[PDB]
């Protein structure tokens, strides 16, 4: 049990590491997507002119 549980702990730390990576990516993505959207609006206005 001693060995298993310490293994389990380090594994759960790695699980946290992944969860962090995915949460950060989601944060990045929201901003990037919405700025790209308004940049595309600006682009299309320029196109229309």
């Amino acid at each position: 049990l001693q060995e298993e549980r310490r293994i389990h702990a380090f594994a759960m730390l790695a699980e946290r590491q992944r969860r962090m990576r995915e949460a950060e990516e989601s944060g990045r993505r929201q901003v990037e997507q919405k700025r790209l959207q308004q940049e595309d609006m600006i682009f299309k206005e320029v196109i229309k002119v």
């Binding site: 049990l1 594994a11 990576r21 949460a23 929201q30």
Partner: protein, 165 residues
């Protein structure tokens, strides 16, 4: 068994266990394993309480292995891990499918699309507000609370349930 909760399905000799077997540990972890002298002596896979798989090879009753895979089946590296990172910021499903088969707004970690309900944040397990220092679980109950270091990490790094701008 009883006194910690361990469980085994296999063969017994002298009353101590010697087996090729599936197995349960009072983590409520599941395992598949071989035994000698009443000890694990096997190449065996450990299936988490969260289903995911760790692997364990046994030398004289100690472990010597590396493999992991998530409960979704994402293959993982504990080192160098090349995933959703400098080579490509795509999640497991987005790398496997590419563009998710119909482009539902699950071109993001969880959807169909909604605001985070309470306020708070997404960090995948739980909702957390920097204005409350509380984490919550996706049943909107509760999770471990956090002062400044973790609060500041959440504040910079992840996605709040701000109003959808």
């Amino acid at each position: 068994m009883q006194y910690t909760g361990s469980q085994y399905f296999g063969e017994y000799i002298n009353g101590r266990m010697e087996g090729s077997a599936e197995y349960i540990l009072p983590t409520d972890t599941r395992y598949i394993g071989e035994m000698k002298d009443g000890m694990f002596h096997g190449e065996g896979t450990l299936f988490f309480p969260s289903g995911s798989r760790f692997d364990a090879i046994w030398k004289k009753g100690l472990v010597v292995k590396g493999k992991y895979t998530f409960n979704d089946g994402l293959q993982y590296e504990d080192k160098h891990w090349h995933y959703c990172d400098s080579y490509d910021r795509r999640f497991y499903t987005e790398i496997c499918y590419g563009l998710k088969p119909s482009g539902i707004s699950q071109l993001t970690n969880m959807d169909p699309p909604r605001r985070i309900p309470l306020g708070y944040y997404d960090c995948g397990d739980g909702f957390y507000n920097p204005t409350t220092r509380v984490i919550k679980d996706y049943r909107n109950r509760f999770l471990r609370n956090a002062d400044d270091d973790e609060h500041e990490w959440i504040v910079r790094t992840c996605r709040k349930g701000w109003l959808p701008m």
